[PDB]
Design a protein around this ligand. Structure first.
Ligand SMILES: [Mn+2]
Ligand SMILES: [Mn+2]
Ligand SMILES: [Mn+2]
Ligand SMILES: [Mn+2]
Ligand SMILES: [Mn+2]
Ligand SMILES: [Mn+2]
Ligand SMILES: [Mn+2]
Ligand SMILES: [Mn+2]
Ligand SMILES: [Mn+2]
Ligand SMILES: [Mn+2]
Ligand SMILES: [Mn+2]
Ligand SMILES: [Mn+2]
Lengths: 102, 102
């Protein structure tokens, strides 16, 4: 993610939607917080058990915190178990489908 | 779209994001209103020129109206010029990427 981004909100109490000028990202809130905790604690079991789970509503402030920290992780791509932290769609795929330039 | 859906908001002042249990839809606000106006007026030039354009902010109420009407169109799929009204992503593609069942 570029430094300039827009948080669109939570989906299914599971993903944080955030976009920059290139992609829309669907960030798994559990995998992100597990990665945040794992880089601090260096213990994957502890990081997992203390992190938020899917199905929990998050406040706007909590969402802001997580996304800000995400950009500074050493590994913002995969959790300690190797699962992708996010799904991404290039914005151009959305624009081109409806016949718009991007 | 199924009758039960969740509007997630506007993106880039261009798309309305709305999901049901199967897909997340990115609905082009101009193409949707052009389709609404075209089915009423039966004039594609008039329908186009009176419809909202990309880049206009829409109120929550206006967004609700458009999405409610979208589901009742005779052709909710393509505008009178044949451009797809929306892009869609199966929710399972997002969930499966992060290792979740859906
Ligand atoms: Mn441990
Ligand atoms: Mn875990
Ligand atoms: Mn675990
Ligand atoms: Mn803050
Ligand atoms: Mn993990
Ligand atoms: Mn493409
Ligand atoms: Mn005319
Ligand atoms: Mn038009
Ligand atoms: Mn036109
Ligand atoms: Mn209303
Ligand atoms: Mn058209
Ligand atoms: Mn698939």
């Amino acid at each position: 993610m570029k430094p300039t981004y827009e948080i669109l909100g939570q989906m299914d109490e599971t993903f944080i939607l955030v976009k920059d000028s290139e992609y829309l990202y669907f960030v798994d809130q559990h995998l992100l917080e597990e990665r945040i905790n794992y880089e601090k604690l260096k213990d994957e079991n502890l990081a997992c058990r203390i992190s938020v789970k899917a199905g929990q509503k998050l406040s706007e402030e909590k969402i802001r915190e997580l996304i800000k920290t995400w950009r500074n992780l050493e590994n913002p791509h995969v959790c300690p178990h190797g699962r992708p932290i996010y799904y991404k769609i290039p914005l151009r795929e959305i624009y081109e489908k409806v016949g718009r330039n991007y």
